[PDB]
Amino acid sequence: LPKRMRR
């Protein structure tokens, strides 16, 4: 949750 990759 603190960092999120897209796809």
Next chain:
Amino acid sequence: GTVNWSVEDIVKGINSNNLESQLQATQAARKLLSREKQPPIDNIIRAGLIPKFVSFLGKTDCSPIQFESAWALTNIASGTSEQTKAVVDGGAIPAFISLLASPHAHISEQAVWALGNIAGDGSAFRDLVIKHGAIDPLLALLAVPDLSTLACGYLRNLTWTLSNLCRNKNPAPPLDAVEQILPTLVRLLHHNDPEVLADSCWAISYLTDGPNERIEMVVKKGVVPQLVKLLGATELPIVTPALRAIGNIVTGTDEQTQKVIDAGALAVFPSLLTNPKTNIQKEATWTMSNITAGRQDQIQQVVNHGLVPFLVGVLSKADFKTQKEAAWAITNYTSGGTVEQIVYLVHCGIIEPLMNLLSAKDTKIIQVILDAISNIFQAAEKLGETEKLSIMIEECGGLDKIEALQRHENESVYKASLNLIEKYFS
């Protein structure tokens, strides 16, 4: 087909002087970085592509390459601290902050996301994002009469990025930044989307995890009633951060705690203290322990709401960590309660599960339990009823436990158990 290029192909395209070839290779990079099986972030970093992507962020006349490099940089920034650092080191922060002004919602959304990953790395990058001035353009993205007119995924990404600006400690975010952000958080706490609500609650729980001046910044905005309402939600991803924020708040002053009680929180605790999720039971019991450490009229509200039997129940059967928090709740109750209230607590059946817990392999819970026992014995002396309680403790196998604890490694354990044996079991 920009599907499955090699990094060398990507470098060859990005190094051409052909904006359209560069756009093609940047999209190839993006598709490489958004596969889930081990995206080759380090090979992209090592190829030296980050400065190129960052410069593509400023090609306002080619919005597609803005989008593709924004997305690629977003996914690099999602990685380790070293990878996020590489993005920051390429000058990405002010370029993404400029992109927040873009007329294309998908591009400004991607800049929001990238800034959220950067800030989510930790205090230093969070504060660096704040110093470059991200808060005002972020907040301006939400200056509409009705949040419901914004795209769902857009509003969710903004909320998540804002909560990352609220997150982390040592240091906590700048006071002025928190004050700038809080009115918008309050508005988001009343939105109807579960995910927006969950992330707003997480942000409030971050802001309330600190000293009482931070808690007060939040409580002064009047969000506690709304937090209690969310505490009653059916969606666990909402109840978890609402409960954490409420528990943070009751670690503060007795007047802040009182705001939580005034808002009606205690009426939710029958279901929280029997909640099927172990973490909810643990956090609700932790919250109860910081409420029983309050004033006697607050202990009295706990009693009136019928919550002493629920504390007895969680002491009798629960995950061990929950039982430790219940032991704390009991020792706080007995330390601050009137004799009438301690008597009530014994009448509800506290003694036998307290005794059963003395056979646990955790030193601190044994200290906690022995302290509670001593407090109950002192209330008993105040009533000349120490013999009755001695008999109760002897009748459920407690005396055996205290006597065996006389011979114990910890100093406080053997001292307190020996005190009890000599003062009341002789």
